[PDB]
Amino acid sequence: ALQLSREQGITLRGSAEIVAEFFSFGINSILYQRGIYPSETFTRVQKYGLTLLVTTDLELIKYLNNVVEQLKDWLYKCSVQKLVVVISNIESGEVLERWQFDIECDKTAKDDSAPREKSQKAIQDEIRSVIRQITATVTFLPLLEVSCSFDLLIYTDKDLVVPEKWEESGPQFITNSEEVRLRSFTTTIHKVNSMVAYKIPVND
Amino acid sequence: PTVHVEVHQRGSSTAKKEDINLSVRKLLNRHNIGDYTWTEFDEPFLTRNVQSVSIIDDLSACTVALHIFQLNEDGPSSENLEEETENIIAANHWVLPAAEFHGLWDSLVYDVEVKSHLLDYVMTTLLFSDKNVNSNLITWNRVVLLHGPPGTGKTSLCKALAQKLTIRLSSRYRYGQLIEINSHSLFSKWFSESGKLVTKMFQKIQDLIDDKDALVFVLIDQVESLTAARNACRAGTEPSDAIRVVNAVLTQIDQIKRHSNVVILTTSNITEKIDVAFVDRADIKQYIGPPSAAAIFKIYLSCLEELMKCQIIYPRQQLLTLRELEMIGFIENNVSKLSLLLNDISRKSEGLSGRVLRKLPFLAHALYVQAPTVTIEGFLQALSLAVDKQFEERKKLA
Amino acid sequence: PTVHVEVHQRGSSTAKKEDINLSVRKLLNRHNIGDYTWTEFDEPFLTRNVQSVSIIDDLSACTVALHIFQLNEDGPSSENLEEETENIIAANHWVLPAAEFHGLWDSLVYDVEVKSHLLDYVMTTLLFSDKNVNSNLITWNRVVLLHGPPGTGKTSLCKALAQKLTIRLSSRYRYGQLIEINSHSLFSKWFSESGKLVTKMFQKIQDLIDDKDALVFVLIDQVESLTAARNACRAGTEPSDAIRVVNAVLTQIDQIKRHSNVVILTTSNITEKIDVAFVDRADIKQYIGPPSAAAIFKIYLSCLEELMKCQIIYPRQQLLTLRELEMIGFIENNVSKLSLLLNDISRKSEGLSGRVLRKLPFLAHALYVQAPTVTIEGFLQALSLAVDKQFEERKKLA
Amino acid sequence: CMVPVVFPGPVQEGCCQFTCELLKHIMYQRQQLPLPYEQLKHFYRKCQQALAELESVLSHLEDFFARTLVPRVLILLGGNALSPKEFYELDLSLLAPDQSLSTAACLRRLFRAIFMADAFSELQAPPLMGTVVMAQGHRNCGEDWFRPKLNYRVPSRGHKLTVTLSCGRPSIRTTAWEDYIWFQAPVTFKGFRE
Ligand SMILES: Nc1ncnc2c1ncn2[C@@H]1O[C@H](COP(=O)(O)OP(=O)(O)OP(O)(O)=S)[C@@H](O)[C@H]1O
Ligand SMILES: Nc1ncnc2c1ncn2[C@@H]1O[C@H](COP(=O)(O)OP(=O)(O)OP(O)(O)=S)[C@@H](O)[C@H]1O
């Protein structure tokens, strides 16, 4: 008659892993729901103890896998601090939607070799909060009267560790856009604040 | 000529100790002539400031030591488990005299002054204690082991003892605390943490222990829940848990020994599997049995009185404890026969539990009264039939 | 002269009470007269708004007190009991009066005429608790423990009881609750869980108590499960856990005896491994063996009325009752002879369980008819065949 | 917490789809269904049968709102009709049968509010539970699929959130509601998951 807590701990690189697949699935679902891509062509998986929208665009599949591992890297070096997905029009390309994710890492993870008290339960349910939240957010995002495309902006403070194919670019603000913040979530190593900017409606 | 005296101080009043002292002494000295229940006032001060002043064990020149108690109001004081498992009832923390238990001292009847024994236990305790006695030489345990078959009032007696000790020790304790040790709570799911937090609980105890203004009243109902067994089969299946946490509880009793204010109340309807540890730490070790005949008699009397006060029997009548019944030589007259048949009720009633007893009058008023109003002379034989039923029930109970 | 009335408002009615009150009392004005179930009416108002009008213990110049009750549907039993959010655990939660038992109290017959007694127990509950009696002088622990040979209506009895109860007591109770613990819930693989389990059980039950408006029925089915061997002489590990359960159970009940709105219906098998404590707080014991010939005949009459009404035996017949059978004193004619054959059946039917009894005609028609059309009293000879079957069945298995 | 909703324009059939999408939104945000019903249009045993449960609910809701008005809508999670494991109140008391704005505009305004109403802030993923919806209705509307509860009362525990409205109308009575009576969903919704 006994049991036992056996807490595993957390790592720099484990945080990077989990938050990477976080953004993976979150981006999947965002670009699924608002209509950005062919919804019909997608499907569902089980992750985070819940159900998730997953694509089949081999193009975007490999692309975002590259992005995922590269972010895993830059987290493992705390390199990036912003992650944004800017959605715009097709031809005139005017920005309609801009999901900003502002990133906190752990420099002390250099010396923070010993783990930190926080459970897969806790992190998992908090990302579930995030996911369900973003999902809900569709209930008020002013619908896209057209079809759209999107571009991927980040901000790593270092202009230093830049791999080959990535190029420097511009800020890409919006003139008349409201910004609304979502719940926060962290790892005690990485936190990510989240807030969507979206073009203020022309007419009420 | 020791005569302890009760003074109920309102939670709604504003008076203080000296005003009430002078006032109550003036009341008595105004009357100054058995035990009575001074509840109908003439003085406006106590009329507005005091709810009840009675005395319970004809003459005046005795040491009338008044004692002022304010029956407080809060019942629960939630002190959840420190570790985890939110909303688990770890501690039921009972303020001193608070009216939960008011007048409940009139529950029991065991005319060998078993009550009074237990009563002046703590009095003599503190007498020896704070009068420079060497612990090392003479020492006891402030455990208190009531002991007896169920349906007897053991936990109830614990409570009432605490209340009465309160009313007594106002001179030395402005207040105090009772501690409902939710035993079954004390344990833990895990392998070890159980004992680990037994400590925490006794630490919450030590909290009160520090308060010299207060007086500590551990109340471990059914201590076997604490102490399962040192004598089971080897399949105890939680041995490194069970026996361990038990002897931990032992350690905690043994540390709390040295103080001079705590008292531990312990009972068992289930003495069978008591673990030698306690019984050898050997509190008063007060055995109890079922109520006596005269006990049943007094308790039925009290029942009748509460009834007539709530008008459930409408024609209010007169009763006679066995004292006056025996003085009148049991002469069979109309007045006497009431209480005489009552005595017969008792004499056939013995062999039952006071619990079932105080169940009887009401449940009979249900069973055979069968009317929203009823009088004595049928209510009594009604109770008789009820008790007959009770015996035949325990019989059929197989 | 109090004659209560079973005012069934069909949930389909949707009309409000007072109109129904008026119309039903006007129905009474009309008929002005044994106890009956009025359904077929004259005014279309009631014809739509009512589904049945019944009354149990002719005359109408008395004090008629109506009882407008609306049925309900779903017993979800949804009760988490989340020790760690991962538990699907055995706590039925029945909103009171509902189609679960509508018409059940009509049938559960008992030799002792238990019903009236057990029934007006809870009636006495209000009218002579809410007199604001000092509880701490006269208590009534709300813990009723029926018992008897297994399969003797007991759990059914308590259910139908609370049903009819909540019916009778609307004015002071917007509704009530039935919480059905199922001890299979309560155990655990792990030492020290069960206590927390029970505490949390009555934590949610305390929740339902908290509303002064509702009415609480704790429908324990097999208390013995809990109290197996608190005071007994086997190995101790299973006993360690068992004690550590029953102790807390008892303490919790002694808590919950502090609300005028709870009734703990309890039940057990032969069960003589019962207890030493629920034995104690058995404010209403009740032995219920197999019924006697009388109740048997009544139940069979109910059966035959079912088989006539649903036209599963087509040619309807005429019956009598023991009272009616005695007005002409069992004297023989080809009219009542058939009821007399049923009587011979009963005279040899006793010694069984009513469960099996009301199961019989079902079984007989399934096993000896094979004709969805069948003449009654051809029915009865094969019925007796199945009776003798049941006998020798027990004989074999035992 | 407590949150009303501010509208400049009045309504009538708005209320209907208001409750509809709100209910839906909720049952998702309490994990009862893997995805929002608006997107459950994929995948066409428990899955489809529970979804059809829900659809019948929705349909008769539309029926009911078409029949008469509603002051208040109730949505339960577990417990019973007279006590929830948790619940959500949806006020429609402040509305009369006007508007040239789009219903979707009120929907998205109110839902942006809900988001800013910060609700559904519970990391504690609840288990799979039971769900019932209720609301008041006309004293005599002859409603059939629902069923009244003439003894019903709003329970007062586990107040997750009462969603309240305000359409900018000055001041209405209360007797226009005192005649109405709670009905109840005839069948408990169950929320599944894999
Ligand atoms: N002799 C008695 N005099 C007065 N009240 C009694 C007596 N015996 C039983 N009672 C009543 O029965 C209840 C006993 O309360 P407790 O203190 O819990 O009893 P007990 O000592 O715990 O015995 P158990 O273990 O609970 S059966 C109270 O309601 C008492 O009023
Ligand atoms: N005297 C009776 N009158 C009518 N029905 C009865 C009678 N005795 C038993 N029954 C039927 O037998 C069944 C008994 O259900 P329960 O309430 O569980 O019985 P019980 O007394 O609990 O015994 P068990 O072992 O718990 S089933 C029901 O279907 C009743 O209708």
Instruction: Give the integer Cα–Cα distance in Å for A59 and B289.
Output: 87
Which amino acid is it at D20? Answer: C
- The phi and psi torsions of B139 (rounded to 5 degrees) equal -150, 155
**Was C148 annotated as part of a binding site?**
yes
Question: By CB neighbour count within 10 A (0-12 exposed, 13-18 middle, 19+ buried), where does C134 fall?
Answer: middle
Instruction: Give the integer Cα–Cα distance in Å for C296 and C292.
Output: 6
The single-letter DSSP state of residue B50 is: B
Residues just before a chain gap in chain D (C–N exceeding 2.5 Å) are 11, 44, 97
Identify the three-state secondary structure at position B99.
helix
Measured between CB atoms, which of B237, B311, B355 is closest to C281? B355
Whether the CA torsion C350, C354, C358, C359 is positive or negative: it is negative
Q: Kindly give, in sequence order, each residue whose CB lies less than 8 Å from that of residue B192, ignoring residues fewer than 6 positions away.
A: A2, B241
Identify the three-state secondary structure at position C311.
coil
Q: How far is the CA of B360 from the centre of ligand 1 (A)?
A: 14
Count CA within 13 A, CB hemisphere, residue D134.
Answer: 27
Instruction: Give the integer Cα–Cα distance in Å for B253 and A57.
Output: 71
Among all chains, which residue has been given the structure tokens 């009548």? Answer: B317
**Was B34 annotated as part of a binding site?**
no
Instruction: Give the integer Cα–Cα distance in Å for A126 and B398.
Output: 59
Ligand 2 atom having least distance to the Cα of C269: 25
Enclosing H/E stretch for B90: none
Among all chains, which residue has been given the structure tokens 């004005």? Answer: C29
- Asked if D29 and A49 come within 8 Å (Cβ–Cβ), the reply is no
Enclosing H/E stretch for B53: strand B53-54
Distance from CA of A13 to the nearest CA of B (A): 31
Instruction: Give the integer Cα–Cα distance in Å for D93 and D106.
Output: 16
Instruction: Give the integer Cα–Cα distance in Å for C277 and C257.
Output: 15
Partners of residue B52 in chain C, C-beta under 8 Å: none
Instruction: Give the integer Cα–Cα distance in Å for A125 and A120.
Output: 8
Structural contact between residues B268 and B224, judged by C-beta atoms closer than 8 angstroms: yes
* A149's tokens: 């495309």
Q: Kindly give, in sequence order, each residue whose CB lies less than 8 Å from that of residue C63, ignoring residues fewer than 6 positions away.
A: C1, C2, C3
Ligand 1 atom having least distance to the Cα of B157: 17
Residue B309: closest CA among B14, B37, B127: B37
Q: Kindly give, in sequence order, each residue whose CB lies less than 8 Å from that of residue B211, ignoring residues fewer than 6 positions away.
A: B177
* C68's tokens: 């407008």
Structural contact between residues C212 and C176, judged by C-beta atoms closer than 8 angstroms: no
Distance from CA of A7 to the nearest CA of B (A): 15
* B361's tokens: 């009058």
- The phi and psi torsions of D86 (rounded to 5 degrees) equal -160, 165
Instruction: Give the integer Cα–Cα distance in Å for B196 and B8.
Output: 42
Structural contact between residues D7 and D109, judged by C-beta atoms closer than 8 angstroms: yes
SS3 string of chain D?
CCECCCCCCCCCCHHHHHHHHHHHHHHHHCCCCCCCCCCCCCCCCHHHHHHHHHHHHHHHHHHHHHHCCCCEEEEEECCCCCCCCEEEEEECCCCCCCCCCCHHHHHHHHHHHHHHCCCCCCCCCCCCCEEEEEEEECCCCCCCCCEECCCCCCCCCCEEEEECCCCCCCCCCCHHHHCCEEEECCCCEECCCC
Q: How far is the CA of C293 from the centre of ligand 2 (A)?
A: 16
Which of B85, B182, B194, B362 to mutate to probe the C interface, most C CBs <10 Å?
B362
For residue A16, give Cα distances in angstroms to A76, A77, B11, C348, D172. 6, 9, 62, 81, 57
**Was C239 annotated as part of a binding site?**
no
Q: Is C77 on the interface with D (CB under 8 A)?
A: no
C-beta neighbour count of B266 within 10 angstroms: 27
Instruction: Give the integer Cα–Cα distance in Å for C258 and C266.
Output: 19
Ligand 1 atom having least distance to the Cα of C137: 31
- Do B and D make contact via 3 or more CB pairs under 8 A? The reply is no
Burial C109-128 (b: 16+ CB within 10 A, else e): bbeeebbebbbbbbebbeeb
Protein residue whose Cα sits closest to atom 3 of ligand 1: B108
Structural contact between residues A136 and D30, judged by C-beta atoms closer than 8 angstroms: no
The preferred substitution site among C111, C152, C224, C286 for testing ligand 2, maximizing ligand atoms within 8 Å of CB, is: C152
Protein residue whose Cα sits closest to atom 30 of ligand 1: B153
Residue D154: closest CA among D64, D90, D62: D90
Nearest CA in chain A to B241: A1
For residue B127, give Cα distances in angstroms to B6, B169, C271. 21, 11, 52
Q: How far is the CA of D104 from the centre of ligand 2 (A)?
A: 58
Q: Kindly give, in sequence order, each residue whose CB lies less than 8 Å from that of residue C199, ignoring residues fewer than 6 positions away.
A: B88, B89, B182, B184, B185, C248, C252
- Ligand with smallest separation from the Cα of B288: 1
For residue B28, give Cα distances in angstroms to A98, A111, B42, B286, C306. 87, 80, 12, 36, 76
Question: By CB neighbour count within 10 A (0-12 exposed, 13-18 middle, 19+ buried), where does C189 fall?
Answer: exposed
Q: How far is the CA of C108 from the centre of ligand 2 (A)?
A: 7
Enclosing H/E stretch for A60: helix A58-76
Q: What is the resolution of this structure in A?
A: 4.6
The single-letter DSSP state of residue B321 is: -
SS3 string of D113-137?
HHHHCCCCCCCCCCCCCEEEEEEEE
Structural contact between residues C223 and C268, judged by C-beta atoms closer than 8 angstroms: yes
**Gyration radius of chain A over CA positions:** 18
* D152's tokens: 């019903």
Distance from CA of A158 to the nearest CA of D (A): 34
Partners of residue B237 in chain A, C-beta under 8 Å: 1
Partners of residue D142 in chain C, C-beta under 8 Å: 14
Protein residue whose Cα sits closest to atom 11 of ligand 1: B355
* DSSP one-letter string for A84-126: EEEEEESSS--EEEEEEEEEE--GGGGT--S--S--HHHHHHH
Ligand 1 atom having least distance to the Cα of B290: 1
Enclosing H/E stretch for B103: none
Which of D22, D33, D41, D42 to mutate to probe the A interface, most A CBs <10 Å?
D42
Structural contact between residues C118 and C144, judged by C-beta atoms closer than 8 angstroms: yes
Q: Kindly give, in sequence order, each residue whose CB lies less than 8 Å from that of residue A167, ignoring residues fewer than 6 positions away.
A: none
For residue A150, give Cα distances in angstroms to A30, A37, C123. 11, 10, 73
**Per-domain boundaries in chain B:** 1-70, 71-291, 292-398
Whether the CA torsion C322, C324, C326, C332 is positive or negative: it is negative
Residue C118: closest CA among C159, C72, C150: C159
- Ligand with smallest separation from the Cα of C104: 2
The single-letter DSSP state of residue B291 is: P
Q: How far is the CA of C68 from the centre of ligand 2 (A)?
A: 27
Residue A125: closest CA among A11, A29, A18: A18
Ligand 1 atom having least distance to the Cα of C250: 26
Structural contact between residues B395 and B352, judged by C-beta atoms closer than 8 angstroms: no
The single-letter DSSP state of residue B62 is: S
Structural contact between residues B213 and B173, judged by C-beta atoms closer than 8 angstroms: yes
For residue D194, give Cα distances in angstroms to A51, B146, D32, D33. 8, 56, 11, 10
The single-letter DSSP state of residue B273 is: G
Instruction: Give the integer Cα–Cα distance in Å for C356 and A38.
Output: 64
Which of D21, D37, D106, D123 to mutate to probe the A interface, most A CBs <10 Å?
D123
**Was C151 annotated as part of a binding site?**
yes
Identify the three-state secondary structure at position B275.
coil
Measured between CB atoms, which of A51, A132, A140 is closest to D108? A140
Identify the three-state secondary structure at position B393.
helix
Instruction: Give the integer Cα–Cα distance in Å for B132 and D166.
Output: 76
- List residues near ligand 2 (CB under 6 A): C 107-110, 150-157, 267, 291, 295, 299, 354-355, 358
Instruction: Give the integer Cα–Cα distance in Å for B270 and B152.
Output: 12
Structural contact between residues B153 and B354, judged by C-beta atoms closer than 8 angstroms: yes
C-beta neighbour count of D185 within 10 angstroms: 24
* D42's tokens: 């994929």
Among all chains, which residue has been given the structure tokens 């018409």? Answer: C103
Q: Kindly give, in sequence order, each residue whose CB lies less than 8 Å from that of residue A100, ignoring residues fewer than 6 positions away.
A: A82, A83, A84, A179, A194, A195, A196, A197
Instruction: Give the integer Cα–Cα distance in Å for C197 and C191.
Output: 11
Question: By CB neighbour count within 10 A (0-12 exposed, 13-18 middle, 19+ buried), where does A2 fall?
Answer: middle
Instruction: Give the integer Cα–Cα distance in Å for C236 and C96.
Output: 40
